[PDB]
Design a protein around this nucleic acid. Structure first.
Ligand SMILES: [Mg+2]
Ligand SMILES: [Mg+2]
Ligand SMILES: [Mg+2]
Ligand SMILES: [Mg+2]
Ligand SMILES: [Mg+2]
Ligand SMILES: [Mg+2]
Ligand SMILES: [Mg+2]
Ligand SMILES: [Mg+2]
Ligand SMILES: [Mg+2]
Ligand SMILES: [Mg+2]
Ligand SMILES: [Mg+2]
Ligand SMILES: [Mg+2]
Lengths: 131, 156, 199, 135, 80
RNA sequence: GUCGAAGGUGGGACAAAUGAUUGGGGUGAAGUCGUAACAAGGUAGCCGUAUCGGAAGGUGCGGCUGGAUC
RNA sequence: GUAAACGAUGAGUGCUAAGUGUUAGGGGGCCCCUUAGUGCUGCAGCUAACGCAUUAAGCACUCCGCCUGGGGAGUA
RNA sequence: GUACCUAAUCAGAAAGCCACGGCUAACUACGUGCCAGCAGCCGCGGUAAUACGUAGGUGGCAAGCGUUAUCCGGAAUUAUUGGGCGUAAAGCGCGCGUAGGCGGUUUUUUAAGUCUGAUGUGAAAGCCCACGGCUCAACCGUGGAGGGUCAUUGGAAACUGGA
RNA sequence: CUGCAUUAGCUAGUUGGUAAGGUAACGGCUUACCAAGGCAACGAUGCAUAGCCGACCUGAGAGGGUGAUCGGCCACACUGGA
C-alpha cells in the first residue's frame, strides 16, 4: 500500500514535469501544501490551489516552463524515508547544487528551506532536495 | 582550436580473403575558453582518421559554464555504462582527472576540478559521459532567470 | 652541492637553461646522449608533469625528498599551492644569496652558505635549505668580506629582484617581503607540478 | 538490499589468501605445533635439486630445488640466475614470488644468501643475484 | 543526594518470590546504516509484597546488589 | 575432622597425524575407442525423473524454447 | 517434494503519450464513456545491446528472497 | 675537555643502487638463439631480441637503492555514502501466515527519537593549528582546536514515536 | 567493545525466598531449608582466537587494518595449591 505520500508527491511532479504537463492534481495533506508553497516561493512552480473535497482535500500545482520550454525543476529526490529517516544539525545542513538548488527541511520552526534553517540556526529532518 | 588525440584503435572487418584493418581516432577539440567538442574518424591510415575526427569534433562543440576556471556545481555525467563525477575545486587544486576526462576538461578551459570515473573505462563512453555532465551544468544567472529571482535571492 | 653532475646535460634534457643564460641550449638544444640529435617522440601527460617537476627541482638544486617535503609544507599554507611552493623555494637561503648576487651561480651560492661565509641577522647560518622570512638581513662573514668570488660577483651588477634589497657597499641584503609569481621564474608551470604530486 | 535487510544481515567482505603460505607459518618444536607468524624469508634444506619443463607455450629446462623449510613445510623454490652451486643437503634462504611458467613453484631461492652462491659474471642488477661489485 | 537510575518497563515474569522481571525496551542505532533497532533487557527487581503481576507497567530504581542477579527495586506500578 | 594441589582409575567427547586398500577430481605426449553437443550437427536441443548400455550416451513420461525448412 | 515448476521478470501501492482486438460487466446517446481481465502495435523514459513500454524492464516508496570470476562442486 | 668556538693545512680521503616493450620516465650495439634465460600482468626468447646476458648511452633516486613479507588504497569487487537479480552471477515452484520492518487524512496533547543551549566530563602524550627554542629541519616546549553512540539540566515542536 | 549455527538448546547453588555464618563491604559469597525457577534466535551453551585503551597505518570521506616504542588500566613471576 501507500507508504510515502511525500515521495509520491515528488514523483507525480517529476513525472508531469518530464512530459511537460501544465498542471497536476494530487491528494492533499498539510505537509504537501507546505512543500508546494516553498516551491512557488522559490520559483520552481507557478501556483498552488487547494480544493476541499470532503476527504483529505486536493492540491493543484501549476508547473513552470522557461522560454524554449526549459524546465525550472530539473530534479527532485526524497532524502528522509520511512525505511531510513535522515536528520541534520543546523551546522550540517546540506547545500543542494552549491546553492542553485534547495533542501526542504522539517524543523520545530516549521517546514522551511535550508537557507532559512541555517539563518534561524534550527536543524531537522531533511524531507527532500529540489534543484 | 587545440586538438588532442584521446585514443587510436585498429579495428577489423572479416572478409573471405581475411581481416581488413582500419584505424579509428577519438579526438577532443577545444578553445580552452568554455567550448569543447569530441569527434570520431575512421580511415585506413591514422592521419586521415585523426583529420576526420577533428572535423567531426568541430561540428559538435558544447558551451561549458565555468566559474573562474572551475565548474559551477558538482555533477555526475552518465552515458551508457560510462559515469563521471565532477566536483568544483578551489584555485591551485589542478585538474584531478584520469585519461579521457582530463583532455575534455582541459580543452574546455577548466583548470581546477575534482573528478572520478565511476563506470566504464572505454575511452569514447568516458568522453560522452564527461560531455553529458558538462551539458547538465547550470549557471546561477540562468537558474535565477528560470526561477524568476535575483542571483542574490537565489543564495538568500 | 648535492647533485654535482653535468648541469648542461640536465638543461639540455629539460629544455631549459639552469644557469639562466642559455649557454647550455645555444649549440645543442636537444636531449643528451646517443639518441639526442634524433627526433624526440611526444611526451605523455605523465612525461610532461615529470619534466616540469624536474625543471623546478634541478633549477633549485634540491634532492627529491627535500623537494617533496617543501611541496607539502607549501601546500599546508593559504592560497594557491603552486605559487606558495615557488615562493617558498625562492625563500631558501641558497636562492636568496644567489638572487642578492653574492655569487654568480646557484651552486656557488650554495657552497658559500654551506662553508659558513653567510650571516643571517648577524649570526652564522650554514644550512642552504634555511627558510628566510621577510625582515631578515643576509650578510657576508666579516672575514669573507674580501673573497675574490664574492667581490667579483657583486661587481657584476646582477639584477636584484624587487622583493630583495641589496647594498653592494656593505654586502648586505634584506628580505623585504615575500616574492610574487611575476618575480619568480616564468619558465615553470607550477600547475603541472601540483598535478604530478596528485598522481 | 533494503536497509532492514542490511541491519538484519550485514554486508560481508571477501577474505583473501596469501600467494606465499609457507612463509607465513612457523613451528614450535617443544609444543609440537605450527605458529602463525609473517616472515619475509625462511631458511630451508634442499631435499632435491633438478630441472623442470615450463607450461606451454614456453620451452626450457628450469632450475629448481625442493626445500624442507624450518617450519617443516616442503616446497618447490625456483633457482634464479645463470648457473648454480646448489646440491641436495644445501642450506638456502627462500623468499616469496611465484614462477608463472612453472606450476608448482611458488617461491624463489635467494642468491648470495647462506649456501647459495652469487651468479658469476653478473655485472647488471647484481643485488638481485647476490653478486659483489666487480671492481 | 546523588540520584540512582530509574527505568520503566513491563513485568514479564512474576514466578519468583518477592521478585519480578522487568523488560526495558530501548533503541540501538546501527553504527553504519543509522536505523534504530528495538532492544530489550530483562532487569531482576525486588517486589517485597509480590504486588506486581505479569503485564503491568512498572517503575524500577537501581539499588545495591540484593541477590546474585537482582540490582533494582520496584518504585511504583504505572499501569496494570 | 572438613575443605583441598598433585596423583590414580573409568566411560565418554573433540582434534590432529598416520593406515593395507579404495573413490572421484586436477594436470600432463600428437596414447586407445567411439562421435554426444555446436548447422535441421545429420534422431532439434535442453530440464526433472526412471531405467538400460564400454564410453560419450539411448529410451520412456512430463515440461521449456534458450528450436522447427517448406 | 523435484522440473527450462519460465513471463528464466517476488509482493503491495501510486504516477507517466497514443492506436487497435478480445472476455465479463456498468452507464449514456450503431456510436460514445467507464470497470476488471486478456493480446497486438507504439511515445516518453529506460537498457550493454536485444528489447521493455499503464499487463514496464519507465518514474517512486515499503517489505522479503537472492548475487559477488570460472572450474573443483551442488562434490566432500 | 663532550658540544660549541678559533686558527692553520688540504679537492685532497667521502657514490652507490635499480630501471630503460607497454603500464612507466629513460635505446642502441654486440653475443645468444623457445637454448641460456626473463617475468607483476600482457608476455619475451626457435638467427637483424629497445623484453635474455654484456657494453655504450639514458632515466629515476641517493647514503642509499632494490627484493621479499604484511596492511590500507586504487576495488563503486559487500556498494550507508556508493552496485545489482528478463537474456551476464542472482526472484524461493506457489500459497497460508507468526515475529519483525513499514504504513492514509485532521485536531489536541506529550516529548522518547529530532532540533537548539548550559553545566560536568571525554588524562597526559599524539594528530591538527599557532607561536616560541634548538644555525635549519627532524626534534623539544607552550597555548588553542578537535575527539561521545556521554551524563545532567533548560528550551523548540515540523516530522517519527506515545496518548 | 570478537568470529563460527556444518555450535540450539543451557543451567540444579542453578533462579528466587527464609535463616545463619562469612567479608571492609552488598550478595548463593557460603551452608541448611522452601519453591521451581533463570538464560537463550535481541545467539544462550560450545568452539576458536585475543590482554584492553589513549593511539597508530591507510583512505577525499565514509570506512578498512592494527594495538611496537610512550602513558593509563588489567593479568602474570619455574608449574599448581595455600
Ligand atoms: Mg553428433
Ligand atoms: Mg542430434
Ligand atoms: Mg535401450
Ligand atoms: Mg529448484
Ligand atoms: Mg486493458
Ligand atoms: Mg633482469
Ligand atoms: Mg571498498
Ligand atoms: Mg542467469
Ligand atoms: Mg516466480
Ligand atoms: Mg588530550
Ligand atoms: Mg594470549
Ligand atoms: Mg576510496
Amino acid at each position: 500500500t501507500m507508504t510515502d505520500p511525500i515521495a509520491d508527491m515528488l514523483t507525480r511532479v517529476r513525472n508531469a514535469n518530464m512530459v511537460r504537463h501544465e498542471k497536476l492534481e494530487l491528494p492533499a495533506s498539510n505537509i504537501k501544501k507546505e512543500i508546494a508553497e516553498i516551491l512557488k516561493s522559490e520559483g520552481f512552480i507557478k501556483n498552488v490551489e487547494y480544493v476541499e473535497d470532503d476527504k483529505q482535500g486536493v492540491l493543484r500545482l501549476f508547473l513552470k516552463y522557461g522560454q524554449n520550454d526549459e524546465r525550472v525543476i530539473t530534479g527532485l529526490k526524497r532524502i528522509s524515508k520511512p525505511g531510513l529517516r535522515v536528520y541534520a544539525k543546523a551546522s550540517e545542513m546540506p547545500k543542494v547544487l552549491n546553492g542553485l538548488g534547495i533542501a526542504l527541511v522539517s524543523t520545530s520552526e516549521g517546514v522551511i528551506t535550508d537557507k532559512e534553517a541555517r539563518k534561524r540556526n534550527v536543524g531537522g529532518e531533511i524531507i527532500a532536495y529540489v534543484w | 582550436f587545440e586538438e588532442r588525440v584521446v585514443t587510436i584503435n585498429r579495428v577489423a572487418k572479416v572478409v573471405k580473403g581475411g581481416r581488413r584493418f582500419r584505424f579509428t581516432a577519438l579526438v577532443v577539440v577545444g578553445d580552452k575558453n568554455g567550448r569543447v567538442g569530441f569527434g570520431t574518424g575512421k580511415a585506413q591510415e591514422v592521419p586521415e582518421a585523426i583529420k576526420k575526427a577533428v572535423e567531426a569534433a568541430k561540428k559538435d562543440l558544447v558551451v561549458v559554464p565555468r566559474v573562474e576556471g572551475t565548474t559551477p556545481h558538482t555533477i555526475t555525467g552518465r552515458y551508457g555504462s560510462g559515469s563521471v563525477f565532477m566536483k568544483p575545486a578551489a584555485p591551485g587544486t589542478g585538474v584531478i582527472a584520469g585519461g579521457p576526462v582530463r583532455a575534455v576538461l582541459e580543452l574546455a578551459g577548466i583548470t581546477d576540478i575534482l573528478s572520478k570515473s565511476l563506470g566504464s573505462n572505454t575511452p569514447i563512453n568516458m568522453v560522452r559521459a564527461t560531455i553529458d555532465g558538462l551539458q547538465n551544468l547550470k549557471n546561477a544567472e540562468d537558474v535565477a532567470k528560470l526561477r524568476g529571482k535575483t542571483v542574490e535571492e537565489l543564495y538568500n | 652541492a648535492r647533485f654535482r653532475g653535468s648541469n648542461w646535460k640536465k638543461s639540455r634534457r629539460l629544455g631549459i637553461s639552469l644557469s639562466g643564460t642559455g649557454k647550455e641550449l645555444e649549440k645543442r638544444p636537444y636531449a643528451p646522449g646517443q639518441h639526442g640529435p634524433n627526433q624526440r617522440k611526444k611526451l605523455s601527460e605523465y612525461g610532461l608533469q615529470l619534466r616540469e617537476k624536474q625543471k623546478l627541482r634541478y633549477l633549485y638544486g634540491m634532492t627529491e625528498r627535500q623537494f617533496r617535503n617543501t611541496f607539502d609544507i607549501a601546500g599546508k599554507k593559504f592560497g594557491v599551492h603552486g605559487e606558495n611552493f615557488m615562493i617558498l623555494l625562492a625563500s631558501r637561503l641558497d636562492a636568496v644569496v644567489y638572487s642578492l648576487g653574492l655569487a654568480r651561480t646557484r651552486r656557488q651560492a650554495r657552497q658559500l652558505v654551506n662553508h659558513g661565509h653567510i650571516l643571517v641577522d648577524g649570526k652564522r647560518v650554514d644550512i642552504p635549505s634555511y627558510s628566510v622570512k621577510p625582515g631578515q638581513t643576509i650578510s657576508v662573514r666579516e672575514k669573507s668580506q674580501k673573497l675574490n668570488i664574492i667581490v667579483e660577483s657583486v661587481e657584476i651588477n646582477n639584477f636584484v629582484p624587487e622583493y630583495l634589497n641589496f647594498d653592494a657597499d656593505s654586502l648586505t641584503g634584506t628580505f623585504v617581503r615575500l616574492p610574487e609569481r611575476s618575480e619568480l621564474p616564468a619558465e615553470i608551470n607550477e600547475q603541472l607540478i601540483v598535478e604530478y604530486y596528485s598522481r | 538490499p533494503t536497509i532492514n535487510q542490511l541491519v538484519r544481515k550485514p554486508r560481508q567482505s571477501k577474505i583473501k589468501k596469501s600467494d606465499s603460505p609457507a612463509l607465513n607459518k612457523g613451528f614450535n618444536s617443544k609444543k609440537k605445533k605450527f605458529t602463525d607468524l609473517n616472515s619475509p624469508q625462511k631458511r630451508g634444506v634442499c631435499t632435491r635439486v633438478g630441472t623442470m619443463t615450463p607450461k606451454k607455450p614456453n620451452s626450457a629446462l628450469r632450475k629448481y630445488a625442493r626445500v624442507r623449510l624450518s617450519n617443516n613445510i616442503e616446497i618447490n623454490a625456483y633457482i634464479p640466475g645463470i648457473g648454480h652451486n646448489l646440491q641436495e643437503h644445501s642450506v638456502v634462504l627462500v623468499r616469496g614470488g611465484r614462477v608463472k611458467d612453472l606450476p608448482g613453484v611458488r617461491y624463489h631461492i635467494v642468491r648470495g644468501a647462506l649456501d647459495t652462491s652469487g651468479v658469476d659474471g653478473r655485472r647488471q642488477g647484481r643485488s638481485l643475484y647476490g653478486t659483489k661489485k666487480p671492481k | 543526594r546523588n540520584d540512582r537510575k530509574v527505568y520503566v518497563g513491563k513485568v514479564v515474569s512474576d514466578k519468583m518470590d518477592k521478585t519480578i522481571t522487568v523488560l526495558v525496551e530501548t533503541y540501538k542505532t546501527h553504527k553504519l546504516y543509522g536505523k534504530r533497532v528495538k532492544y530489550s533487557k530483562k532487569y531482576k527487581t525486588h517486589d517485597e509484597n509480590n504486588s506486581a503481576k505479569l503485564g503491568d507497567i512498572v517503575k524500577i530504581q537501581e539499588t545495591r546488589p540484593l541477590s546474585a542477579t537482582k540490582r533494582f527495586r520496584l518504585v511504583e506500578i504505572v499501569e496494570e
